[PDB]
Structure 1
Amino acid sequence: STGSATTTPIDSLDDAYITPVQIGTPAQTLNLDFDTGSSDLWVFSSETTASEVDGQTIYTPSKSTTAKLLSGATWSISYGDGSSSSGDVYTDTVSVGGLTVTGQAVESAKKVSSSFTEDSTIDGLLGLAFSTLNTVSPTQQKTFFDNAKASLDSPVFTADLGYHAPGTYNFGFIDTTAYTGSITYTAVSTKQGFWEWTSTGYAVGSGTFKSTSIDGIADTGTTLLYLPATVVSAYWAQVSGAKSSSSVGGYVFPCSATLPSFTFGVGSARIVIPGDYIDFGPISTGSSSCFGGIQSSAGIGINIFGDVALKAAFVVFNGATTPTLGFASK
């Protein structure tokens, strides 16, 4: 089997992408944030505290003839941005782009943190990291991909995120028309539960490539590119007037600037992030200070190849017995 679904930016900055997901019988379609940095499929629901729902579409398990309470199971998750959610668990039929999994754990939120409530466009998350990170207790549950894997034509999914435009998540096949050149594959460590890999270096604009190992994670659920402070300083030094602002929370730059590209290495291959992809717009409405799309990871503990980096590539998440990542230009 295969599946293919379009993923759509939630706003004009590409802050996140939403993908329609069919849950239950008859289908209830929710727009979920596909997140290769986490491993829970959770949804706003009829059980979510009413004051914490503000415009989201909810899953109502009592209206699904295939929903079953997973007795005794609870979940609770906290994300790298400080947001969180928790609740109970149903199993139900879940379909993405024509690919159907029966008995998928659907984690129904009883509580969500304010950042979720305040974003009416995201109805929940669909985790695509390794199932070892799934938070369901006392019986850990599998991700949608883990459940589908054995049925897929090939045990892979691909992320093809658009810049200021829709893109595609495919399951079970590589669309050889969706990229240019060849796909370069690189080793993955699953020891932290992530799609963790080592970039071979970077360049700023037309500058020389610096060969240096940068361990980080491929994370579709993170907006920005978070890299070591040395790398980030080298980038922003090429933008007149850019500076790190403790009060804003990162590097800002004059909105009048033209940003240089940023290249990262995948083995001997190179992925070029155009400068425009690094502009996240005014820090507040009407400001002439703009927020940068490359930020320091120093306070995180891990480097994160988020959407800024991934949307410059066609990315293969190869879930074979020994997982690997592939990157191609497009």
Structure 2
Amino acid sequence: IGDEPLENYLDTEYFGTIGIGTPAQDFTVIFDTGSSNLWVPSVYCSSLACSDHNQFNPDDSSTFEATSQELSITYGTGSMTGILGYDTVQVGGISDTNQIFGLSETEPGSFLYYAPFDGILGLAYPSISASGATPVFDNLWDQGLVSQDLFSVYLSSNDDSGSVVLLGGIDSSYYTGSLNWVPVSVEGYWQITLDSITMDGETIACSGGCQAIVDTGTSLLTGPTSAIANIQSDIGASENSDGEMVISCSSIDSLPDIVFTINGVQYPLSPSAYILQDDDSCTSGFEGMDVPTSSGELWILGDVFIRQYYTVFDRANNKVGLAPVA
């Protein structure tokens, strides 16, 4: 059972420390269940985002094995160009050997520059892995470094400590009730079939069923522009002087619960969960973002949601187990 602590940064981003090479060079990376590749900056990249963070140095690693493969990835936030190579990665107490990861050469963009993390570590299916690059967890399994072919995730709240990624294991102390399993509709992302999104009994979106993915790499609960407008209007969201979705803080106590129905079970969201705030202003936890797929306009169960529900990713039964957090 592997244990990997995640640092909660402003309830918006969750990263952790991994080590690469011999000796081990440290990097903070985001554990993305919406990605499948692992990559960190390197001394070959001269971009501003790279000079801005830790750069991996091949020359100072004795267990490093170079490759002749180009790598490229485009995220909803930024892009990256690199090269591939083998070395030992250390994730949550485990020595992930012969692991193939990427070395940036170009991390263009403003976003990667202000980000606090050096890189990203994908936990999704190898299907969506650029360059056919064997993802980390898949490599941990193949080499029998984890007892079970699954892992669970727990995210803290209110900038707290405790966020953890359990590799090859489940831990009852994080949840209450019984885990309700949900089958994965399409293997690539951790995609699932939503049945509806209601509020006060009336269906306010995804009426008739729709697709969604459980993404830890996204802060807000995302959905098609169209549908989110309605939702926003229902909770009281408004476009202010700074292009943001704000709502009268005090309205929280008033506002009702928005319910998500997954696989026939009801998983509600408290006005305290789908509404982010500080001791100043309260922002809407929702964000409209069209994500075209062969199936349709995709929904994204981001951090807003995952904070309320301990989540298990079962690569053996290809399911997603959920249960209200502890």
* Range into which the TM-score falls when normalised by the shorter chain: 0.7 to 0.9
SS of equivalent to 2:171: coil
1:148 equivalent to 2:116? Answer no
Q: Which moved more, 1:47-56 or 1:308-317?
A: 47-56
| CA RMSD in angstroms, aligned pairs only | 2.5
Please tell me whether the aligned partners of residues 186 and 192 of structure 2 are also in contact (alpha carbons under 8 angstroms): no
Is the Cα contact below 8 Å between 1:21 and 1:31 reproduced in 2? yes
Q: Distance in 2 between matches of 1:3 and 1:46?
A: 30
Question: What is the SS of the residue equivalent to 2:172?
Answer: coil
CA distance in 1, matches of 2:155, 2:63: 32
Q: Is 2:265 the counterpart of 1:269?
A: yes
- CA positional deviation for 1:160: 0.8
Partner SS state of residue 170, structure 2: coil
Aligned length: 311
- The CA distance in 1 between the partners of 2:102 and 2:84, in whole Å, is 4
In structure 1, the gaps of 5 or more residues are: none
Instruction: State whether structure 2 residue 240 is matched by structure 1 residue 213.
Output: no
Kindly state the Cα deviation for residue 61 of structure 1 after the two structures are TM-superposed: 1.9
For 1:287 and 1:172, locate their aligned partners in 2 and report how far apart those are by CA, in whole Å. Answer: 40
Query: In the aligned structure 1, how far is the partner of 2:251 from the partner of 2:30?
Result: 31
Structure 2: unaligned runs, 5 residues or longer: none
Give me the whole-angstrom Cα distance separating, in 1, the residues matched to 2:202 and 2:17. 39
- Contact 2:224/2:291 (CA < 8 Å) preserved in 1? no
TM-score where L is the length of structure 2: 0.86
- Does residue 1:101 correspond to 2:96, yes or no? yes
* Residues in 2 aligned to 1:328 and 1:293: alpha-carbon distance in whole angstroms: 21
For 2:2, the aligned partner's letter is: G
> CA offsets, 1:127-157, max 9 Å, x none?
1111121212xxx211001111242211001
Listed as ranges, the matches of 1:263-302 within 5 Å are 263-281=259-277, 291-298=283-290, 301-302=297-298
1:37 is the counterpart of 2:37: no
Please tell me whether the aligned partners of residues 101 and 133 of structure 2 are also in contact (alpha carbons under 8 angstroms): no
Distance 1:209 1:328 in 2: 24
Equivalent residue number for residue 305 of structure 2? 309
Q: Deviations over 1:265-318 (max 9, x none)?
A: 232433233323333459xxx996x54221224465311111111111110110
Query: Does the alignment pair 1:190 with 2:186?
Result: yes
Following the alignment from structure 2 to structure 1, what is the Cα–Cα distance between the partners of residues 285 and 19? 32
Within 2, Cα distance between the matches of 1:42 and 1:302?
A: 26
Aligned pairs for 1:1-330 within 5 A: 2-10=1-9, 12=10, 14-49=11-46, 51-70=48-67, 72-81=68-77, 83-112=78-107, 113-119=109-115, 121-136=116-131, 140-150=132-142, 151=144, 152-164=146-158, 165-166=160-161, 167-191=163-187, 193-204=188-199, 207-208=200-201, 210=203, 212-228=208-224, 231-240=227-236, 242-243=237-238, 248=243, 251-258=245-252, 260-281=256-277, 291-298=283-290, 301-320=297-316, 322-330=317-325
Letter in 2 for 1:227: G
